[PDB]
Structure 1
Amino acid sequence: SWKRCAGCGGKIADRFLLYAMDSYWHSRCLKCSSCQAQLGDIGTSSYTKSGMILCRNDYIRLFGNSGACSACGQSIPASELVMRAQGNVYHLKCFTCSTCRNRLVPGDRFHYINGSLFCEHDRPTALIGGDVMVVGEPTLMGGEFGDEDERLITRLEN
């Protein structure tokens, strides 16, 4: 007897199919609730939460830890890369020298005084803060997240 698809209720006669969430699927029937991507082709897993079945990217977007830019105040989505300094997060284009306005990039030396950033050549001696810091590589805003909602997809031959 063929298996029935959890997405459409039809018998699955296809040579290749999917298993995920304890169910069988026509690959075309296992789709992201948000973006309609065919989960079994785009990646190796789905996420279940709040009645939805999501791709990784939409799971991050909808449920990942968003932040806010200390410079401009505006929210940052979990998917965006950010610069970090002194426990704050910044949009890449917000991560600038307060004096000359140069954008700071990984490996740069810089100074931080009360939320103000200064490049190596604008050490704010009058304000001084004297600690030289090194700009780190950007990281994702949402950071690492657990896999509690992740459900791997298995590609099967019938």
Structure 2
Amino acid sequence: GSYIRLFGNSGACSACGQSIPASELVMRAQGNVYHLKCFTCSTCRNRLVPGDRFHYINGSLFCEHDRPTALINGGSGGSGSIAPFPEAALPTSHPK
């Protein structure tokens, strides 16, 4: 295993992967987990906020400012995607 940076294999965000604590709520979407601080677009690094417009395509984070229009299934009369909320997912393993 090479991708394992999550103090083992409990849970981590694809942006940084620095431990998913039970204390810090994490943003979960289709089938992936992210940190509320790591919830930023990969184009302009705009933080996605619950109540603000964001884009989630192929498991990637974009924003209203970039708005990848060349490959957005549903980008018709203004896509209305809103950033999800952070909830507690899984605790990280701590090797004592």
**What is the TM-score normalised by the length of structure 1?**
0.43
The structure with more radius of gyration: 1
**Which residue, 54, 58, 61 being the options, matches 1:110?**
54
Determine the structure 2 residue equivalent to 1:79. Answer: 23
Percentage of matched positions with identical amino acids:
84
**What is the TM-score normalised by the length of structure 2?**
0.65
Alignment of 1:87-126 (within 5 A): 87-126=31-70
Q: How big is the shift at 1:142?
A: 4.0
Q: How big is the shift at 1:129?
A: 4.5
For the pair 1:134 / 2:78, whether they are aligned, the reply is no
For structure 1, list consecutive stretches of 5 or more residues without a partner in the other structure: 1-65, 144-158
Give the structure with the larger helix fraction.
1
Number of residue pairs matched? 78
Which one scores higher on RCO, CA 8 angstroms, separation ≥ 6?
Answer: 2
Supply the AA of the counterpart residue of 1:104.
Answer: L
4+ long deviations beyond 4 Å? none
